Coordinates of C-alpha atoms in Angstrom, one line a residue:
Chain W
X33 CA -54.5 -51.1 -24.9
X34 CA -52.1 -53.9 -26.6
X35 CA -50.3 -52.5 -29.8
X36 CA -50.7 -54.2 -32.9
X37 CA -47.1 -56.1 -34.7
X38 CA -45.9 -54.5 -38.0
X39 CA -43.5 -57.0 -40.2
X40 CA -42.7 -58.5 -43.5
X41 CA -44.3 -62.2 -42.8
X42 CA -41.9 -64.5 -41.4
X43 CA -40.9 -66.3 -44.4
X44 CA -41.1 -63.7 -47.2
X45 CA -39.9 -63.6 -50.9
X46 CA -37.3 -61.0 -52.5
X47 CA -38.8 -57.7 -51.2
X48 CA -35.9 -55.2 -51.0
X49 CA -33.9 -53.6 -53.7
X50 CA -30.3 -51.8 -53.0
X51 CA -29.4 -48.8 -54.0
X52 CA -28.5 -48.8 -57.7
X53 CA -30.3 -52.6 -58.1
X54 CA -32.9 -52.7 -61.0
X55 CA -35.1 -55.7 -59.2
X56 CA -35.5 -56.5 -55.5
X57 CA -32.1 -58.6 -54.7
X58 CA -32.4 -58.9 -51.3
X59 CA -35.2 -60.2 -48.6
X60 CA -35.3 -57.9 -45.7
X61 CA -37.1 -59.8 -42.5
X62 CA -37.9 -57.2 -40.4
X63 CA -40.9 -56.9 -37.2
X64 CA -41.9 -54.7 -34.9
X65 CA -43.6 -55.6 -31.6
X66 CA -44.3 -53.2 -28.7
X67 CA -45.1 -52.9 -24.5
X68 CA -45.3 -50.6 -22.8
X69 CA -43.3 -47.2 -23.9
X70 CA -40.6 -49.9 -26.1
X71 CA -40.7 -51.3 -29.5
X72 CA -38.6 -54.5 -30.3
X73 CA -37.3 -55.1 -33.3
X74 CA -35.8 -58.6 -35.1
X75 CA -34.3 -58.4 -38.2
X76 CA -32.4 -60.3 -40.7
X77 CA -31.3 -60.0 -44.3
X78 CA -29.8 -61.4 -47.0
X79 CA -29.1 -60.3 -50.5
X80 CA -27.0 -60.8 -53.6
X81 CA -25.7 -57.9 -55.6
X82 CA -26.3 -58.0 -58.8
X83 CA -23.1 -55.8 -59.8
X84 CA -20.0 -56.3 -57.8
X85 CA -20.4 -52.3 -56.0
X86 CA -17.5 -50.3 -56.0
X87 CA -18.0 -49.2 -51.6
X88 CA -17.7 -51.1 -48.4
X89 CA -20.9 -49.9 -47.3
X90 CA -24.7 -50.5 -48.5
X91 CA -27.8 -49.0 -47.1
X92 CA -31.6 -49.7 -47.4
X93 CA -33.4 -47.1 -46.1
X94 CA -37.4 -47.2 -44.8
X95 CA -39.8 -44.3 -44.8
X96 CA -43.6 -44.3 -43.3
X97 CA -46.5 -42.1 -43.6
X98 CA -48.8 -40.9 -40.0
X99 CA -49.9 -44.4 -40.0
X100 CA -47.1 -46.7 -40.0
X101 CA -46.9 -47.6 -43.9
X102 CA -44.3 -47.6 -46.0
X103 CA -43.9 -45.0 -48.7
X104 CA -42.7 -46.1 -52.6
X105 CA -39.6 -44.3 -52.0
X106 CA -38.5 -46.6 -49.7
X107 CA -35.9 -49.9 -50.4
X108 CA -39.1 -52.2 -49.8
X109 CA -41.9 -53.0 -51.7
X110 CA -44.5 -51.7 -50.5
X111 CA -46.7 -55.4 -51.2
X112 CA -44.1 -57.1 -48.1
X113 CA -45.6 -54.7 -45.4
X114 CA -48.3 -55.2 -42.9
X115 CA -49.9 -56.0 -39.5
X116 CA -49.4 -59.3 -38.4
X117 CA -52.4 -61.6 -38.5
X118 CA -51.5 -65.4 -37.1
X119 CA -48.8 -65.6 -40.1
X120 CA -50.1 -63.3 -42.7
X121 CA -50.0 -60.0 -43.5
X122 CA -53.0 -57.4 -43.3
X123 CA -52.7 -54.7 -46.0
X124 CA -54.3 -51.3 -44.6
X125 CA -52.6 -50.9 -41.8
X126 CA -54.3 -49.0 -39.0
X127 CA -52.5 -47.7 -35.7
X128 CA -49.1 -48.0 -37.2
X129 CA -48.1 -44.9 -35.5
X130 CA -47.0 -46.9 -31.9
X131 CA -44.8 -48.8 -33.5
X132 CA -43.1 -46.0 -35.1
X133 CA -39.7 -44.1 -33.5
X134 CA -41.1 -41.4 -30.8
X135 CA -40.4 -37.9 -32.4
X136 CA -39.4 -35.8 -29.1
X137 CA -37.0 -38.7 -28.2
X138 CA -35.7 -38.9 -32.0
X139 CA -36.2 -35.8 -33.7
X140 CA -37.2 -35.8 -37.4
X141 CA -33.9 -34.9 -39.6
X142 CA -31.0 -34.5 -36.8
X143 CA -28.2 -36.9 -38.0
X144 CA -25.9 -35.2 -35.3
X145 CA -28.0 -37.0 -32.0
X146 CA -26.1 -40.2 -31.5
X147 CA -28.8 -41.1 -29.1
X148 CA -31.0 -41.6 -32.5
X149 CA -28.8 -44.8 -33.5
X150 CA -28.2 -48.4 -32.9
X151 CA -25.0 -49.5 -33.7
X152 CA -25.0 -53.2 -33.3
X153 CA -23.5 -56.2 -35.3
X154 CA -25.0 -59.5 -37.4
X155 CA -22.7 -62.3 -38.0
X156 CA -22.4 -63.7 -41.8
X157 CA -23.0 -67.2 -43.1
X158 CA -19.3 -67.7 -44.7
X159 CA -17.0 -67.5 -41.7
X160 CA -17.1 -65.5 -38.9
X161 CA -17.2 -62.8 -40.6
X162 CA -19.6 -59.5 -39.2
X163 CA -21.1 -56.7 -40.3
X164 CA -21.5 -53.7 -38.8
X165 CA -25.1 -52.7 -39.1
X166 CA -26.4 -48.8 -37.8
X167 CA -29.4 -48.2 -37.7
X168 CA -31.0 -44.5 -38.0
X169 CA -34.2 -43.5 -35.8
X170 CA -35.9 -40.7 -38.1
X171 CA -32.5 -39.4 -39.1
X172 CA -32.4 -40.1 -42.5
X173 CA -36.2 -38.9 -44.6
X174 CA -37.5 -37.7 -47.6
X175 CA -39.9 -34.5 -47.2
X176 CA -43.1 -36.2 -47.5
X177 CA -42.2 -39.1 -45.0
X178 CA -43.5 -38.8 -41.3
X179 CA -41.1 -41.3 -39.7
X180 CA -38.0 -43.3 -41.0
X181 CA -35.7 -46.3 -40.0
X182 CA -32.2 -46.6 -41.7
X183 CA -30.1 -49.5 -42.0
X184 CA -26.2 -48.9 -43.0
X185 CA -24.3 -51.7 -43.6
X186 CA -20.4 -51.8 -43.4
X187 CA -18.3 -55.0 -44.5
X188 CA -14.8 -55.8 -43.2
X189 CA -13.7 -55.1 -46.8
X190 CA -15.6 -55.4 -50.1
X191 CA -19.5 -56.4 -49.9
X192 CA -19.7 -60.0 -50.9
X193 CA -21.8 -61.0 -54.4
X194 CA -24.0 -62.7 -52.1
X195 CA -24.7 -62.9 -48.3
X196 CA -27.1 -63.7 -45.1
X197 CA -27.3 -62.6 -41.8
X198 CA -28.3 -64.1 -38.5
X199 CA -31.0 -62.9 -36.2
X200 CA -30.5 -59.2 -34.8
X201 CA -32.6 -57.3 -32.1
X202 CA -33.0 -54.0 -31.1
X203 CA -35.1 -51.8 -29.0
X204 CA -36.4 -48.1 -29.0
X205 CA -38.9 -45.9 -27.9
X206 CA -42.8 -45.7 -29.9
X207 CA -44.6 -42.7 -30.5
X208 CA -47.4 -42.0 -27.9
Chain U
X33 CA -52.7 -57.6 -16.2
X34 CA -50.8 -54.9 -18.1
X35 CA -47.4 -53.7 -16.5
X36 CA -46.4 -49.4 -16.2
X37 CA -43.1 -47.7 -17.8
X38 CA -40.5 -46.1 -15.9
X39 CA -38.3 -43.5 -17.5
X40 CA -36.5 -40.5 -17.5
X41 CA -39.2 -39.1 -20.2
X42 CA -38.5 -38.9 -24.0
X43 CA -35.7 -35.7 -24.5
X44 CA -34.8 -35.3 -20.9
X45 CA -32.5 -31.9 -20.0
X46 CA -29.1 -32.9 -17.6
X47 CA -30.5 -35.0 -15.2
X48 CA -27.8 -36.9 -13.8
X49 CA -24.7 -35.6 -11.6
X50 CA -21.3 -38.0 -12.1
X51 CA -19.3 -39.1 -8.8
X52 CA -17.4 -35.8 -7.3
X53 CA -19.3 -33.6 -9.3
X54 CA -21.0 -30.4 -8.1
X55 CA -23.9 -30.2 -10.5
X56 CA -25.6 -32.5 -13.0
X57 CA -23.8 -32.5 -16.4
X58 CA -24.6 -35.4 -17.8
X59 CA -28.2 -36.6 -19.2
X60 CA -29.7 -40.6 -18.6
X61 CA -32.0 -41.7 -21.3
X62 CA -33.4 -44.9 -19.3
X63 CA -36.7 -46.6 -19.8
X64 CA -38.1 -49.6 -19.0
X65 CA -41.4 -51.8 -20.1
X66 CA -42.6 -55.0 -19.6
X67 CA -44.0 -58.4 -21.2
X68 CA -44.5 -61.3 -19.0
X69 CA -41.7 -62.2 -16.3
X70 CA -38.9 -60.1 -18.3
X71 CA -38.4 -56.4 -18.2
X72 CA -36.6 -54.5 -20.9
X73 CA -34.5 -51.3 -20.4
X74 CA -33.3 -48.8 -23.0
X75 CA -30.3 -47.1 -22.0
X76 CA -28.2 -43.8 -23.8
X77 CA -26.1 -41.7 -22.1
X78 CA -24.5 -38.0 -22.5
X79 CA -22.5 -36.7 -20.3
X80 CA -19.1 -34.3 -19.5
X81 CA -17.1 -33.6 -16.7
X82 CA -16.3 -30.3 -15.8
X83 CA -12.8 -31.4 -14.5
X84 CA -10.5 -34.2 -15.8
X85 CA -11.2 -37.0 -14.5
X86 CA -8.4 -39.0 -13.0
X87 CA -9.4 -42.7 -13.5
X88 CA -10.6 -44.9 -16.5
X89 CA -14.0 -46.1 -15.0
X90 CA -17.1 -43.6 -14.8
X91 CA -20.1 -44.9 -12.9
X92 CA -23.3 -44.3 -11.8
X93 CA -26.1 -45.8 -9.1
X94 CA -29.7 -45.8 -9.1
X95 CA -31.3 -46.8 -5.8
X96 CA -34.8 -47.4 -5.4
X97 CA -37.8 -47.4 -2.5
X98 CA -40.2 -50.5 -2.6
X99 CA -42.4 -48.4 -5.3
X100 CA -39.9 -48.1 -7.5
X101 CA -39.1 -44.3 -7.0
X102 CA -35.6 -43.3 -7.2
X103 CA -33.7 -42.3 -3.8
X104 CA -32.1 -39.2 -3.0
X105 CA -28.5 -40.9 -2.9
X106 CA -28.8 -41.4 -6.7
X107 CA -26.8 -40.1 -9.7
X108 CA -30.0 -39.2 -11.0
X109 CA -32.1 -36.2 -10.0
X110 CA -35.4 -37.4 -8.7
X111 CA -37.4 -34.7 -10.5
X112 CA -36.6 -37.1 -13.9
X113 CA -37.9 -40.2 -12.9
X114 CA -41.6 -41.4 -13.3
X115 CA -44.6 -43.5 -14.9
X116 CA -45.0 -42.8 -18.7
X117 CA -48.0 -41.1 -20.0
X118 CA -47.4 -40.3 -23.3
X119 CA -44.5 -38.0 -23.7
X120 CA -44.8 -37.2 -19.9
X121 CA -43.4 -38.2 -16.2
X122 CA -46.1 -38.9 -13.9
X123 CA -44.4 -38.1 -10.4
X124 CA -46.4 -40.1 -7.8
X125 CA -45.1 -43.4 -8.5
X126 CA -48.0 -46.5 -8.3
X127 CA -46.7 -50.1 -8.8
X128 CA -43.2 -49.4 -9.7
X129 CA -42.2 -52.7 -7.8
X130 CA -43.0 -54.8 -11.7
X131 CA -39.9 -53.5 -13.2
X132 CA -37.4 -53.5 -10.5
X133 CA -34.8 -56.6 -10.7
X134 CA -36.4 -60.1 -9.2
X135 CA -35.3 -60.3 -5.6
X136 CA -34.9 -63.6 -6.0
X137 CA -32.9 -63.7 -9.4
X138 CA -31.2 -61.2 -8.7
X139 CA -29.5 -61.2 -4.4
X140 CA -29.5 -58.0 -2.7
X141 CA -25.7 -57.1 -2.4
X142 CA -24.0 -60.7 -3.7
X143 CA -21.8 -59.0 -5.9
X144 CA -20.0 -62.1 -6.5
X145 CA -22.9 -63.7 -8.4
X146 CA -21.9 -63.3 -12.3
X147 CA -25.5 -64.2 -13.0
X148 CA -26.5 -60.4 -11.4
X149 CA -24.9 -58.4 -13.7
X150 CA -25.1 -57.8 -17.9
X151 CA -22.2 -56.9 -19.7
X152 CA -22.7 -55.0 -22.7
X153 CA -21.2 -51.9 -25.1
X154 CA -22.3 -48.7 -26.7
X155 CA -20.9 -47.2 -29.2
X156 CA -19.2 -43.1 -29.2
X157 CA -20.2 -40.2 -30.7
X158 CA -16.4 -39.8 -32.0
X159 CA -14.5 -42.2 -34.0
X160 CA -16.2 -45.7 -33.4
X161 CA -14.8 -46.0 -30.4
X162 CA -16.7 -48.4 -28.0
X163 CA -17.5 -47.8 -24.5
X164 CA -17.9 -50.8 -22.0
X165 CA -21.1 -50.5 -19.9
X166 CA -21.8 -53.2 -17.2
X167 CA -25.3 -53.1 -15.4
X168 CA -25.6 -54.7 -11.7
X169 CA -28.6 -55.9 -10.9
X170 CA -29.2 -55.1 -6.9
X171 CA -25.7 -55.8 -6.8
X172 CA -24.7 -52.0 -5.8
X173 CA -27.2 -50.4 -3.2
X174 CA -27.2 -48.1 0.1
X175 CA -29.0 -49.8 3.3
X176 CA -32.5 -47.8 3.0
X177 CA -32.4 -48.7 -0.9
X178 CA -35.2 -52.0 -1.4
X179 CA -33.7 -52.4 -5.3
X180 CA -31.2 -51.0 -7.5
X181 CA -29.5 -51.1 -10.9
X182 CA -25.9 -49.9 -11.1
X183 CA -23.8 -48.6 -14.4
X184 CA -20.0 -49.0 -14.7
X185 CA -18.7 -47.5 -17.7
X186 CA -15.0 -48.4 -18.6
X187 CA -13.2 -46.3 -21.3
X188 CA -10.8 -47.7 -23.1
X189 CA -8.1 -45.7 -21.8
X190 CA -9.2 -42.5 -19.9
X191 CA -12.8 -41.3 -20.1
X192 CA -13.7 -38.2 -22.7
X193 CA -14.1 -34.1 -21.6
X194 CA -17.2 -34.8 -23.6
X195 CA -19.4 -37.8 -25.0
X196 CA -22.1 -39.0 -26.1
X197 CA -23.6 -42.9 -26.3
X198 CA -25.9 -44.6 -29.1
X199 CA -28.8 -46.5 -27.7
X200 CA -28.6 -49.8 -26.0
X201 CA -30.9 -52.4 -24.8
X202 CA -30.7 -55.1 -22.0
X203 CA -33.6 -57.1 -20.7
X204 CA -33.8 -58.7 -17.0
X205 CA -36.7 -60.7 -15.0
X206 CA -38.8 -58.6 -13.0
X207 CA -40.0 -58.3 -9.6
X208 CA -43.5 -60.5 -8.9
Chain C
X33 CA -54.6 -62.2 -25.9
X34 CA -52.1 -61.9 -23.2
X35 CA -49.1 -64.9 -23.9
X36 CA -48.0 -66.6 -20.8
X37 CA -44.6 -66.8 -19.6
X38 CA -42.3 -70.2 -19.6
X39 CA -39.1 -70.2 -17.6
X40 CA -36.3 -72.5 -15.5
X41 CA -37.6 -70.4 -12.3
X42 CA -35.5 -67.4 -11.0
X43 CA -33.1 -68.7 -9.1
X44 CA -32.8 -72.8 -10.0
X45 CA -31.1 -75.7 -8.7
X46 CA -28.3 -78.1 -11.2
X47 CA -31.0 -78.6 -13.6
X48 CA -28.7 -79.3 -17.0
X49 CA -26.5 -82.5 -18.1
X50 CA -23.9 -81.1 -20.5
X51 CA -23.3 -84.3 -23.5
X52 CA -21.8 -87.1 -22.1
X53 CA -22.2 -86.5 -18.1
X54 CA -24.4 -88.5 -16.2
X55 CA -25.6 -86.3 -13.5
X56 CA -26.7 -82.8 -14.0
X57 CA -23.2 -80.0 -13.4
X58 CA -25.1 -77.2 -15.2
X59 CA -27.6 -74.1 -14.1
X60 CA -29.6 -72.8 -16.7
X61 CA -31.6 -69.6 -16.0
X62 CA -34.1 -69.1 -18.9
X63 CA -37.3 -67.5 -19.5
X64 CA -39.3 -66.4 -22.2
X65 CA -41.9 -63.9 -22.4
X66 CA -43.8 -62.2 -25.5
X67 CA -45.3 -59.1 -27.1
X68 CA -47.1 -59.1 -30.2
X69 CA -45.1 -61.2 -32.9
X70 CA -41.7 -60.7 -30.7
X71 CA -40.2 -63.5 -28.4
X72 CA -37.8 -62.0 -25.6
X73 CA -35.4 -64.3 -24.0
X74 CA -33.0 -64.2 -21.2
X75 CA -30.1 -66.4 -20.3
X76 CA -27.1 -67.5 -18.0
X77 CA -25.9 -70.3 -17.6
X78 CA -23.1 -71.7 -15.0
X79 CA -21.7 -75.0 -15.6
X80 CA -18.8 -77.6 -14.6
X81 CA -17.5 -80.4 -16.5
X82 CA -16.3 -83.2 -14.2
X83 CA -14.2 -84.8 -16.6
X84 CA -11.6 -82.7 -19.0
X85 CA -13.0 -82.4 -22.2
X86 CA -11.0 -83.0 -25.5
X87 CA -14.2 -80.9 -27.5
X88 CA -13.4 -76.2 -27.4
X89 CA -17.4 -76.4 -28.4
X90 CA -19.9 -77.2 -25.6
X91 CA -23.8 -77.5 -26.1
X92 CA -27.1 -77.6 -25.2
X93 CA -30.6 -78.8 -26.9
X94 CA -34.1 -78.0 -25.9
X95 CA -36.7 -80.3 -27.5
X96 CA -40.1 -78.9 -27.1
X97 CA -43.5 -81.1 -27.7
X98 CA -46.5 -79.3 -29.3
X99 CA -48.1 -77.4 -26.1
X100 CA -44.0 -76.5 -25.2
X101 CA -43.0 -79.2 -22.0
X102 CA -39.3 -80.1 -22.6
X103 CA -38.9 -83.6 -24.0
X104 CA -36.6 -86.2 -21.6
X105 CA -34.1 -86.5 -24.4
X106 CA -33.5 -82.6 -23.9
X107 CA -30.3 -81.8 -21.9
X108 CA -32.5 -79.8 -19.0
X109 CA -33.8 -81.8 -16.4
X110 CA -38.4 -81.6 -17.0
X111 CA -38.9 -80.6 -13.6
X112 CA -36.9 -77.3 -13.9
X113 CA -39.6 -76.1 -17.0
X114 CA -42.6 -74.7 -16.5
X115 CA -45.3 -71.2 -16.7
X116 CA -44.4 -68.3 -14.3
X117 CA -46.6 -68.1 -11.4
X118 CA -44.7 -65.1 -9.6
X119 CA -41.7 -66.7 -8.3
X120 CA -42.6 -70.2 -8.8
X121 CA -42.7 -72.2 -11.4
X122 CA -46.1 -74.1 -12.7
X123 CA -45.7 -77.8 -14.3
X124 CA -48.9 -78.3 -16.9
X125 CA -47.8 -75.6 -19.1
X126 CA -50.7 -74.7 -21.3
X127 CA -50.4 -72.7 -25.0
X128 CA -47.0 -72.4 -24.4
X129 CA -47.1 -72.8 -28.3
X130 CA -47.1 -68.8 -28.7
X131 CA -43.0 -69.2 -27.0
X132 CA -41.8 -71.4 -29.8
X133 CA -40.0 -70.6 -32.5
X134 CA -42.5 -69.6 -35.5
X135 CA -42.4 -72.5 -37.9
X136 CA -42.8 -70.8 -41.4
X137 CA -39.9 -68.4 -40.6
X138 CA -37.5 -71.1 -38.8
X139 CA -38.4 -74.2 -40.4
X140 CA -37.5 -77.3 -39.0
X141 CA -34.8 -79.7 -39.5
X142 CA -32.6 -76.6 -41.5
X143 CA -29.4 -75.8 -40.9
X144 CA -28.6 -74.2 -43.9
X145 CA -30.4 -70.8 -42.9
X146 CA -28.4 -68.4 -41.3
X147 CA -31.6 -66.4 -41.1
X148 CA -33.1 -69.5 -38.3
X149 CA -29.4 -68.8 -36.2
X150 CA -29.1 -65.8 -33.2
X151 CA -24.6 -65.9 -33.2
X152 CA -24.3 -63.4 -29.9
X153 CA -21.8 -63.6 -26.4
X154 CA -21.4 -63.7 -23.2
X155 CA -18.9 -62.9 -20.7
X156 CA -17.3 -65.9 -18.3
X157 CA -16.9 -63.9 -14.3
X158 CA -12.9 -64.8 -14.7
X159 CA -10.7 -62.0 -16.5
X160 CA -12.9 -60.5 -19.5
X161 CA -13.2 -64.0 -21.4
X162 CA -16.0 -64.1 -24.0
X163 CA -17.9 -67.4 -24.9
X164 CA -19.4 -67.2 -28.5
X165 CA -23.5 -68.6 -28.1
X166 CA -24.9 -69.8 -31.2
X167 CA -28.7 -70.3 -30.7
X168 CA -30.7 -72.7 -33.5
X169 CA -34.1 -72.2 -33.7
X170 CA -35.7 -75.5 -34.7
X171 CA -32.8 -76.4 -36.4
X172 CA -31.6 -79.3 -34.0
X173 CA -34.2 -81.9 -33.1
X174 CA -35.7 -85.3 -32.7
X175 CA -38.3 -86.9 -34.2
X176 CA -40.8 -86.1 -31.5
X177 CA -39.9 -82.8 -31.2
X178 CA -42.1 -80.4 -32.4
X179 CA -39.9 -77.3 -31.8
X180 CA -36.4 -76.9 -30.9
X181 CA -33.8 -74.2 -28.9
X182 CA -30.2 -75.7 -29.6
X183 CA -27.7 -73.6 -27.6
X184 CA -23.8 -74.1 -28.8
X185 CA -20.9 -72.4 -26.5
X186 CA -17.5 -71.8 -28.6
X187 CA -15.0 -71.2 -26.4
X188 CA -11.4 -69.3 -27.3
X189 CA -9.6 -72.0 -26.1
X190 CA -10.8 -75.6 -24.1
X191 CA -13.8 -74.8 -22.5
X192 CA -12.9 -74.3 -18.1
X193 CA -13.8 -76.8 -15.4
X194 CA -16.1 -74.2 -14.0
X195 CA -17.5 -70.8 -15.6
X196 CA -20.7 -68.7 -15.2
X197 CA -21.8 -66.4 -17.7
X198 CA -23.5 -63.1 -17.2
X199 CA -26.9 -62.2 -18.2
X200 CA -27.8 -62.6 -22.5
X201 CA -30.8 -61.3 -24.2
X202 CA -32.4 -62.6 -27.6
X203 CA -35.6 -61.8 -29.2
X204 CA -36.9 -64.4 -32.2
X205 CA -40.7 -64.7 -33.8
X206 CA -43.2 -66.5 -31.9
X207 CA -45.6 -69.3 -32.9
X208 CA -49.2 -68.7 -34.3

């Protein structure tokens, strides 16, 4: 049994909206690969708000069905999500689930487990300036969603109109 | 060739007793998988001490056999250590040696070898506060012990009644 | 598919000339392995400078052909590159393609891209120094390269006449 890789493409177009955001402002390059019990994620993103927003912190939040695919609800378009096929994406994704957050390890709807976060930190083009990103395992979900991944960003100050992130990894633990 | 997953299991009950402590009151959330020559761990940690704890460092020492099976001598209960199957501990160890630290890499008890050990740093339940977490690869070990990882954790003044850690990750080579 | 694994060996001789030395005063310890999409790497390095350099940066360049041997014009010695054959280390490296850094997402000859950067740290064994490591994926090269692993090392001050870092981890998308 080798698990299947669920990401964005490696070079995609604008495929996230923020909160608030009529279009899709932002590209959000995100991938899952797994061995064994672990999942490894990369991501990156960059954006540019379209309004300067009145809050230090932005979020973009992802919810999947039994199968590993992401719901409409969610901050990406549903079109920039797939199994990874040399460097393409396949549509109907099938066996999703194992790259998805285990649900005994990270319970469905408990934000009070810290052991169901990853705080960690991306630097920003324009200085050396960080971000604070936290990212949620199933802690943050609409009803009809089976699994979920959040991602809370916190600037030193006010958000910048426009901004990109470096490369950031992170590993947790797959269903079954 | 496809390499098995040591862990504590998924939601784990207290499975780990601190230095000077009389039962276990603190729970290890360890796993680790493996691709290739590198092996990558998943580490979150709960614990509290039933007494105030004179002293700003809080550690804890796994020792393993030549299997990979965690010694008596260790913080951490044997009973909650084993092979992943599913959401399950499989107690009979079988080719444990694939994720223990590469002899080679990695010196039984050179301790004076910066290259042994990886500093890194979870983040608090309360506040942000940061805790500094420094694994020692076969650095720490008892005579009997064939491999071992040990965890230092330094508070940034004097160590919590009560906490609780995010998840971190840390990847090392492995053993054959 | 199972991906092979390409490393420096476990425990290497000097196998790195920093810019503008003539002999090699540098150990790098790296080694990459993959799952799915996701390449994992791991690296120390220990260095000294046997002049005083007038420069606080310090760096690095990996110049990879199209089946992944290191170029001469790369600052790590050929012999010390090569597939992982247990503890040994295997000179005609074949498809190690599937280690590089994935084209289409880190395009060559960019620097522009924060997205194509991995900014992380590591710590130097005296006092609790940090170095700042900037890695550039394809974004330093030569003509002949085909792929490219740029390593730059801010330090807080002038870099030391001797240091050794702990152990780093990155992850970054793999070729084909």
């Amino acid at each position: 049994l080798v698990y299947p890789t669920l990401w964005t493409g490696p070079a995609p177009e604008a495929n996230v909206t923020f909160s608030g955001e009529n279009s899709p402002s932002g590209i959000l390059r995100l991938c899952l690969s797994r061995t064994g019990g672990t999942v490894i994620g990369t991501l990156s993103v960059q954006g540019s708000l379209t309004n300067p927003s009145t809050g230090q912190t932005l979020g973009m939040n992802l919810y999947f069905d039994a199968d590993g695919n992401v719901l409409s609800e969610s901050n990406l378009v549903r079109g920039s999500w797939g199994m990874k096929d040399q460097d393409t994406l396949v549509t109907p994704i099938a066996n999703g689930q194992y790259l998805m957050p285990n649900l005994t390890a990270y319970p469905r709807l408990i934000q009070t487990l810290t052991s169901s976060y990853i705080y960690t930190q991306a630097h920003l083009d324009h200085n050396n300036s960080v971000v604070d990103i936290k990212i949620g395992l199933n802690t943050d979900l609409r009803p009809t969603a089976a699994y979920g991944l959040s991602f809370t960003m916190t600037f030193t100050n006010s958000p910048p109109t426009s901004f990109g992130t470096d490369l950031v990894q992170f590993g947790y633990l797959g269903q079954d």
